[PDB]
Amino acid sequence: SPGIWQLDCTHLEGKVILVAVHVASGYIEAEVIPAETGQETAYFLLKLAGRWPVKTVHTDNGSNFTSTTVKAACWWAGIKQEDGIPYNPQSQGVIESMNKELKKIIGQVRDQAEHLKTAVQMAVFIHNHKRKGYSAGERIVDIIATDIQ
Amino acid sequence: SPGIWQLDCTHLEGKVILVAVHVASGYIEAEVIPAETGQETAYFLLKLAGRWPVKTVHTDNGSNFTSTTVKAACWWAGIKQEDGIPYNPQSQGVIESMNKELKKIIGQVRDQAEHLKTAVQMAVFIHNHKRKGYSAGERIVDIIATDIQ
Ligand SMILES: O=C(O)c1c(CN2C(=O)Cc3ccc(Cl)cc32)ccc2c1OCO2
Ligand SMILES: O=C(O)c1c(CN2C(=O)Cc3ccc(Cl)cc32)ccc2c1OCO2
């Protein structure tokens, strides 16, 4: 579980927000792209795997699962690419509830930035620092450090 | 020291690579931008502080130290913005040797990517995963986890 991430793609303002969630902690990373393509997804995964120890990724749809650019980045970065088929049925609503929470945060900071991408990074910041009692940013560091030790 | 980062800016292929180094571990994050501006610097710091607990940033020059967009992002994200004056003189050479190493990594992967930004992210990955036998990615997670507890 310490190396498992789920990809998630949601829309806002006619743009796409790509999200990776660290499943055990709830910690997220996200970026605004003009559209989800294999290339953007591959590049986002290379960034993430250079920052955290990403062992397995549950892809968000079957086009990214199939994409040869995505499989090439997974290969390069050492990542097991898996489907994201929610065999535990809890998954669909969990992803939906996160997207709803993210967009709520985004609407709360929205007026503080001209560009969507700034608002999205503010929301990532607020989501990861929120105490729930540790934050997601705390949990992921504790999970992975425990795993190393 | 677990919340201190140093910003660093280096050039390659007529482009700018902005780097943030976690001083205690050597772990880095980097991005390619067309030019260093306050706005780009501010946005890079907002991204970094949503991912790691950034308490203190030593800015890479006095224009970013002065930049009101940069000070606004530091304020938003709770970061103490400091100068990067190497009061310890070993600082200049250490930053230079890191730039040289990053650029060596980059030339080793350069072939494998059309765009500079991809090669930069491959180099961030290789740099953070290198053992020499803990890696930088391991050290930063141990340092910060030790600090939470
Ligand atoms: O805040 C969140 O990110 C969040 C999440 C995030 N999350 C976790 O905490 C663990 C987890 C596993 C898988 C996925 Cl896909 C999301 C999450 C789930 C449900 C929610 C959320 O907000 C409201 O309902
Ligand atoms: O590989 C690196 O990142 C590296 C570094 C990085 N580094 C550390 O390990 C600790 C540290 C504090 C401050 C700075 Cl500014 C860089 C570093 C320093 C010197 C080097 C390097 O490569 C060769 O010489």
Contact B118 A146 (CB under 8 A): no
Q: What is the Cα B22 distance to its own chain's centre?
A: 7
Report the SS3 class of residue A89. coil
Residue with tokens 């050597």: B26
Residues of chain A with C-beta less than 8 angstroms from the C-beta of B118: 43, 46
**Among all residues of chain B, which has the CA nearest to that of A27?**
B51
How distant, in Å, are the alpha carbons of A45, B5, B121, B122, B137 from that of A50?
Answer: 9, 17, 7, 7, 9
**Which residues neighbour B145 within 8 Å (Cβ) at sequence distance 6 or greater?**
A141, A142, A144, A145, A146
Find the B71 Cα to ligand 2 centroid distance in Å.
26
Q: Which fold has domain A1-149?
A: Nucleotidyltransferase; domain 5 (3.30.420)
**Which residues neighbour B113 within 8 Å (Cβ) at sequence distance 6 or greater?**
B119, B122
**Among all residues of chain B, which has the CA nearest to that of A118?**
B43
Q: What is the Cα A88 distance to its own chain's centre?
A: 19
Residue with tokens 């991204």: B47
Q: Which experimental technique did the depositors report for determining this structure?
A: X-ray
**Which residues neighbour A37 within 8 Å (Cβ) at sequence distance 6 or greater?**
none
- Dist CA B71 CA B85 (whole Å): 17
Q: Dihedral of CA B99/B104/B105/B107: which sign?
A: positive
Residue B23 CA: which ligand 2 atom is closest?
A: 12
Pocket test for ligand 1, best of A1, A94, A104, A135 (most atoms within 8 A of CB): A94
Return left, alpha or beta for A91; rule: phi > 0 is left, psi -120 to 50 is alpha, else beta. Answer: alpha
**Among all residues of chain A, which has the CA nearest to that of B45?**
A121
Resolution (A): 2.0
Q: Dihedral of CA B49/B52/B56/B61: which sign?
A: negative
Q: CB–CB of A86/A23 below 8 Å?
A: no
Whether A95 is in the pocket of ligand 1, judged by its Cβ within 6 Å, is yes
Residue A93 CA: which ligand 1 atom is closest?
A: 19
Q: Smallest Cα–Cα separation from A148: which of B149, B24, B135?
A: B135
- The burial of B27, by beta-carbon neighbours within 10 Å (0-12 exposed, 13-18 middle, 19 or more buried), is given as buried
Burial A32-49 (b: 16+ CB within 10 A, else e): bbeebbbebbbbbbbbbb
Give Dmax over CA atoms of chain B in angstroms: 44
- Dist CA B117 CA A47 (whole Å): 10
Q: CB–CB of B67/B139 below 8 Å?
A: no
How distant, in Å, are the alpha carbons of A34, A91, B11 from that of A124?
Answer: 19, 20, 29
Q: What is the Cα B18 distance to its own chain's centre?
A: 7
Q: Dihedral of CA A52/A58/A63/A66: which sign?
A: positive
B47 touches chain A (CB under 8 A): yes
The domain ranges of chain A are: 1-149
A124 touches chain B (CB under 8 A): yes
SS (H, E, C) B3-19: CEEEEEEEEECCEEEEE
Question: Across the interface, which of B49, B118, B141 has its CB nearest the CB of A144?
Answer: B141
* Pairing of β B15-22 and β A27-33: unpaired
- Dist CA A138 CA A5 (whole Å): 16
Q: Which amino acid is at A100?
A: K
Contact A76 B141 (CB under 8 A): no
Contact B148 A141 (CB under 8 A): yes
- Dist CA B63 CA B47 (whole Å): 20
Q: CB–CB of B2/B29 below 8 Å?
A: no
